[PDB]
Design an enzyme around this catalytic site. Structure first.
Site, PDB file in Angstrom:
ATOM      1  N   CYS A  48       0.834  -1.228   0.000  1.00 24.55           N
ATOM      2  CA  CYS A  48       0.000   0.000   0.000  1.00 24.55           C
ATOM      3  C   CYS A  48       0.864   1.271   0.000  1.00 24.55           C
ATOM      4  CB  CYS A  48      -1.083  -0.033   1.100  1.00 24.55           C
ATOM      5  SG  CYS A  48      -2.148   1.412   1.366  1.00 24.55           S
TER       6      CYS A  48
ATOM      7  N   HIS B 289      -0.398   1.372  -3.360  1.00 20.96           N
ATOM      8  CA  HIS B 289      -1.756   1.868  -3.496  1.00 20.96           C
ATOM      9  C   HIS B 289      -1.774   2.913  -4.617  1.00 20.96           C
ATOM     10  CE1 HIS B 289      -5.621   3.723  -2.642  1.00 20.96           C
ATOM     11  NE2 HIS B 289      -5.879   2.596  -1.995  1.00 20.96           N
TER      12      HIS B 289
HETATM   13 ZN   LIG Z   1      -3.363   0.862   2.781  1.00 21.80          ZN
END
Ligand SMILES: [Zn+2]
Ligand SMILES: [Zn+2]
Lengths: 187, 187
Positions: free
Chosen positions: B105, B125
């Site tokens: 992420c 992300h």
């Molecule tokens: Zn995250």
């Protein structure tokens, strides 16, 4: 007026099935209380993640009622939920007031123990099916998430996002669920 | 001889991205140490789940090296990881010994901060892409999990199972990953 969720956290709970719904519900603007069955002390989950609850269940109950009561799975956690007179009272109160109850994996077997929602369609983890179905008090489903009115059930760690988003939809609607879903990078 | 994983847990970490890999790695028989960046005190995650670490990072380092170092996401958690001289040392040591580093992420932006793995293909992300790509030191990927040799990256809460199972495969092989996967009820 934000919706409110009670997540009941017992020793041996499946930590993914606890954290995914808590996090996703908070993303949806639900006020979530993580309540420790045994008190406000840290809880050792099934795979040894230790979670510090927001409150004891005893204190959390005094701040009810809640728009949803959530029961994570984990066999040992579910057994602890199933043995608890306090959980029985909370679930019966929630059922009596026509409030949502959501349980995942082995969690639904606590509904059986506390005689909640008989006559509903339910799912569980595949390995918990026989326990849940003892007596034929529910009708079994293989759906990844099952919802029969105010009884919402699901199957395992890998259905936890679907379970959590189903709770969000039930409380805050389809649009909020879709908005919360997109930033998660689900497939 | 069980493989060993270090998961570095900072305030503001994404709790799903922390717990899913810890749990899935433990299911795979990996010995996982959840190490608190700030010390052995409880860590308040991005959506307010509080996790009690197994050890401080300081103590965990003394028990290394590890077969994988795992960096969860959460913007604030990743920023804390990126600012940490201790994390820099751990990552450089891991890179120097040709050990796996796995980040999800916003987590991969700590690799950028610590100048780790330049020239690798990475994902993040979507919202962390521009930060990661500042300077063009990596090549960007939209794959849900990306692995370029010893740098393993992924995108978000909804890719956490895939990320965790990729770590399991890298450490313990495809068969163990498949065995661990089935009971999860992933789609
Ligand atoms: Zn995250
Ligand atoms: Zn489970």
């Amino acid at each position: 007026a934000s919706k409110r969720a009670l997540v009941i956290l017992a020793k041996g709970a499946e930590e993914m099935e606890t954290v995914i719904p808590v996090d996703v519900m908070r993303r949806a603007g639900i006020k979530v209380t993580v309540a420790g069955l045994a008190g406000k002390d840290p809880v050792q989950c099934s795979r040894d993640v230790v979670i510090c609850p927001d409150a004891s269940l005893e204190d959390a109950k005094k701040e009810g009622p809640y728009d949803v009561v959530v029961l994570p799975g984990g066999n040992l956690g579910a057994q602890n939920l199933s043995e608890s007179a306090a959980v029985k009272e909370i679930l019966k109160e929630q059922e009596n007031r026509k409030g949502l109850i959501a349980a995942i994996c082995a969690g639904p077997t606590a509904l059986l123990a506390h005689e909640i929602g008989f006559g509903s369609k339910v799912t569980t983890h595949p390995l918990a099916k026989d326990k849940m179905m003892n007596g034929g008090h529910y009708t079994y489903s293989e759906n990844r998430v099952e919802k029969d009115g105010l009884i919402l059930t699901s199957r395992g760690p890998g259905t936890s996002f679907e379970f959590a988003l189903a709770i969000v939809e039930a409380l805050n609607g389809k649009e909020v669920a879709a908005q919360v879903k997109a930033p998660l990078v689900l497939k």
